[PDB]
Design a protein around this ligand. Structure first.
Ligand SMILES: NC(=O)c1ccc[n+]([C@@H]2O[C@H](COP(=O)([O-])OP(=O)(O)OC[C@H]3O[C@@H](n4cnc5c(N)ncnc54)[C@H](O)[C@@H]3O)[C@@H](O)[C@H]2O)c1
Ligand SMILES: NC(=O)c1ccc[n+]([C@@H]2O[C@H](COP(=O)([O-])OP(=O)(O)OC[C@H]3O[C@@H](n4cnc5c(N)ncnc54)[C@H](O)[C@@H]3O)[C@@H](O)[C@H]2O)c1
Ligand SMILES: NC(=O)c1ccc[n+]([C@@H]2O[C@H](COP(=O)([O-])OP(=O)(O)OC[C@H]3O[C@@H](n4cnc5c(N)ncnc54)[C@H](O)[C@@H]3O)[C@@H](O)[C@H]2O)c1
Ligand SMILES: NC(=O)c1ccc[n+]([C@@H]2O[C@H](COP(=O)([O-])OP(=O)(O)OC[C@H]3O[C@@H](n4cnc5c(N)ncnc54)[C@H](O)[C@@H]3O)[C@@H](O)[C@H]2O)c1
Lengths: 266, 266, 266, 266
């Protein structure tokens, strides 16, 4: 058991195709006791019933100030007073279709970009602010990322939200360090979630479906060890490695679980 | 004359200590014909009267949708129909004191961070969207930046705004390339503007004044050729080099005018 | 047992203060079966006698073409016919004092620089060439590194050799990927080995000694979680995480075990 | 005249297709007074005869310690006693075909790799060591580079030598800064020199020829402003901008003259 006895909060489960669902499943397989958060709760309760073990499901809208202000208290009620968190998983991402997809880069209104940056980047800090007081020293906060160091088609303002998230992670590390807590991001390669498969199937047109297929083919080609977009397990394992006590001198950083694709040009 | 005959729009002049004032002064010394934009216009008209040559001053609030929608037309009226821009200088930056300065990183409300990101990063794209239709092929768009790849004290959410601006610049390059136009950022070292000198004088307390002095001393120490925070000229010259035809195969990039400080650990 | 059942070759043990000694000790505490290499085998035998468990000790001078030609055969005789290695640890670094220390950067003769790059950078590829034919799919090659992205005092040509090692690692990942094997480096913060503590005491003079002390002190300050030069365990555990099956999608990459110092400016 | 009155040493001219030839031609078109070096001086004399203006041609084999010892004295005899250089251009790269091309990465003997790093990386420092005592404050040393941050087919050990050159540049900046001199590299996209066009035609085989063609074709596609392998002028102008007084605060750095390709994923 890699995470034996650890109490880990896991956000971002929407379906059993979510990266967070696999992070939760692998953490439970490694002995961690989970607390799950979710923004449609009826679907969430049905989805999480497919996890190896039972886990309390708390409601969390990262834009709702009341949900965040009460979060530490609601978590303590779920795990019991006298207990604290050893880990936190931020697997939350959102960008309206005006800022991500087929809409031209310049045509995204700032109100939609601002909402995307609030959920995808600012929420990493507001979740750390809420949960650090109830975290044990030696704990770990892990956020999900997708390498934004180079521009690419369709991802557009979500790439901008990820460049902001990377900057936020380095400042969250400064704050988290005071609690003896690490803060890191996992830059994952593309994973065929329900929305990603729908895009490949033509939900966003044949040009967006071709650009995503080209990105996926190129990812597997550049990755020295290959990249299977239908397998979320290598990413979930990497998040568990950062949640464990086996990367204890790593903080404010990014671990690439992308098959090594970002290290190769061709 | 490095910029002989070129028509360059220059935003961001507030006082004669502004980086944009020195960019405008050096561009005029190199033969460029300027169009200046400004967000308190009475002070601006008095300040720009100290420039080597006359230049029309247009009003531009980057958050005002009407100011941006009319900008290309207002610029054409200032330089004359039949004429286009060869360059655009974005020297605009803002972050309320809740997100930059002495306020703790986690205590910045999202509304203030969102406003800071709108002016400091999103506006680089909205200015490029407005001005690219009236730009000549071979033109150049230059934005001002401050290396955000590593976290630091006090700069806090403005560092996050700069990481977002760097990502925006790479997408603006994709769009600008269609017009044969380059888009680059200049990452400058610290420059003693009126606000920066006030901070060193204790406007933000003795701890912020010590952290800024430590940053400035360390910048000059790490810079192999030294760094004079009271001299804006090396930065203004670098912006002019990118505006010229002497860096024609460089776009989506960052040029460091920081004395080389970012290339040295100590 | 994090590395239960795994056969791991560990090079670089010279004294009980070497990072390789701590890597070997933690790898054995986690159930791995080791093969040790040495370049003085009688004195290395006494050092490796202090490890929790016994392990076959093979002679390997990375500059000796014959030692590398026979290496795979000598490893198979030590681990059993039909068996393969699951992990390889390169913890070998060398730079004559003409290229590292108080000697001016320009005063390093190329013959010394060449020997330093041969042992520190080329040997990573020649060890992978000799051991990849005898490694299992899912295997892991880990090399030791220090961040050379920014120049610094005294390290001089050792930094250049580390920049070369980073590039070699990315090409070793291309080759290793054909075998299902990962190749990664661990960029550690400064560790007080027998030589580093002597250099601080005055072995290289008061000016270089002050520069090294200032350089090493800045690590603890920049690191959000702190940094203890006297504790090699956080570095050793990070190596064992890369050798395990918990980072299965990371190759051609660098993991920073530096307390997060490289992510902070000050 | 961008370089009017400046004395600039230019190494690396072999044929009229060399980047050094175009750098020398553009430098002379901009008013600079040149000093050329060569390693075959009678055949280089005929090539340099095609430049706009005459220039003294000195012999320089970067591996010859005697050529480097006498270099400063031979440059002063050519430019006049009391005079100093304002610029130095290192455009020298070499890697035996065992370390670059179709030979497997692991099959490169170290003797060949060592010679390649000596000419491509070490020679940048040994040229700066010999010429810094005879350079003016405000001077500029420019080396030629290709982006080696990501591995790629065929370039193999030449990429490793470029990673080493990037590190050497940052240390040469520390030393050069003591003289008021800058040191920078220009990372160019692929340029069709006599060798590159022969490799595409089939000199290295159909598999490597296809890989090189695919690699070089991806540059034009990724570059927001496009990329013409047959045009060396954009690279030559970028070098002249670094040699001028228009980038006076940039040192230890890399300027990318690659059409912005390195800033885009696809
Ligand atoms: N799927 C990929 O290809 C991929 C690759 C790299 C990184 N990522 C990142 O991994 C993370 C997980 O995304 P995913 O791919 O599993 O997709 P997903 O569809 O499962 O969505 C992630 C979650 O974000 C939640 N969320 C959205 N708005 C929220 C709000 N206001 N409050 C709370 N939660 C909110 C959703 O409910 C969902 O559960 C995201 O940060 C994503 O950007 C995804
Ligand atoms: N001064 C430094 O140390 C330094 C260093 C590196 C980068 N920079 C960057 O350089 C740029 C110039 O800043 P500066 O240091 O010259 O400061 P400055 O005080 O002159 O301010 C820059 C300008 O931004 C303008 N601005 C703010 N909100 C605006 C809005 N809504 N619409 C239009 N304009 C608006 C201000 O009116 C001002 O003219 C900024 O992007 C800044 O972040 C500054
Ligand atoms: N000590 C630190 O501060 C530190 C920090 C970060 C990274 N590193 C890296 O960790 C690695 C291990 O170094 P260390 O700090 O344990 O020092 P160390 O004194 O233990 O020396 C490293 C090893 O290299 C071996 N070596 C040298 N030449 C060799 C040859 N020809 N053949 C075989 N082996 C040879 C030595 O015998 C020694 O065991 C190095 O690559 C070093 O650069 C060290
Ligand atoms: N051609 C490209 O695609 C390209 C792209 C980016 C960067 N570069 C770099 O530009 C530089 C110039 O290369 P090029 O493309 O003009 O090729 P080139 O064929 O002109 O060769 C470079 C020069 O190096 C010289 N050289 C080799 N060994 C030497 C020695 N012992 N002493 C002195 N000079 C020596 C050669 O004589 C030649 O003039 C190189 O450093 C190269 O890596 C080239």
């Amino acid at each position: 058991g890699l995470l034996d006895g650890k109490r880990i909060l896991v956000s971002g489960i929407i379906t059993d195709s979510s990266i967070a669902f696999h992070i939760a499943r692998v953490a439970q397989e490694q002995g961690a006791q989970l607390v799950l958060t979710g923004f449609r709760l009826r679907l969430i309760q049905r989805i999480t019933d497919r996890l190896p073990a039972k886990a309390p499901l708390l409601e969390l809208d990262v834009q709702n100030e009341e949900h965040l202000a009460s979060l530490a208290g609601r978590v303590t009620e779920a795990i019991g007073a006298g207990n604290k968190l050893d880990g936190v998983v931020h697997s939350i991402g959102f960008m309206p279709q005006t800022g991500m997809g087929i809409n031209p880069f310049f045509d995204a209104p700032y109100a939609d970009v601002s909402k995307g940056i609030h959920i995808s980047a600012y929420s990493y800090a507001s979740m750390a602010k809420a949960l650090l007081p109830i975290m044990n020293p030696g704990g770990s906060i892990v956020g999900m990322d997708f390498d934004p160091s180079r521009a690419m088609p369709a991802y557009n303002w979500m790439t901008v939200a990820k460049s902001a998230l990377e900057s936020v992670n380095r400042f969250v590390a400064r704050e988290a360090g005071k609690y003896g807590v690490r803060s890191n991001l996992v830059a994952a390669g593309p994973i065929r979630t329900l929305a990603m498969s729908a895009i490949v199937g033509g939900a966003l047109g044949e040009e967006a479906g071709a650009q995503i297929q080209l990105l996926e083919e190129g990812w597997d080609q550049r990755a020295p060890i290959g990249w299977n977009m239908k397998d979320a397990t290598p990413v979930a394992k990497t998040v568990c490695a950062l949640l464990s006590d086996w990367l204890p001198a790593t903080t404010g950083d990014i671990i690439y679980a992308d098959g090594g694709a970002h290290t190769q040009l061709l």
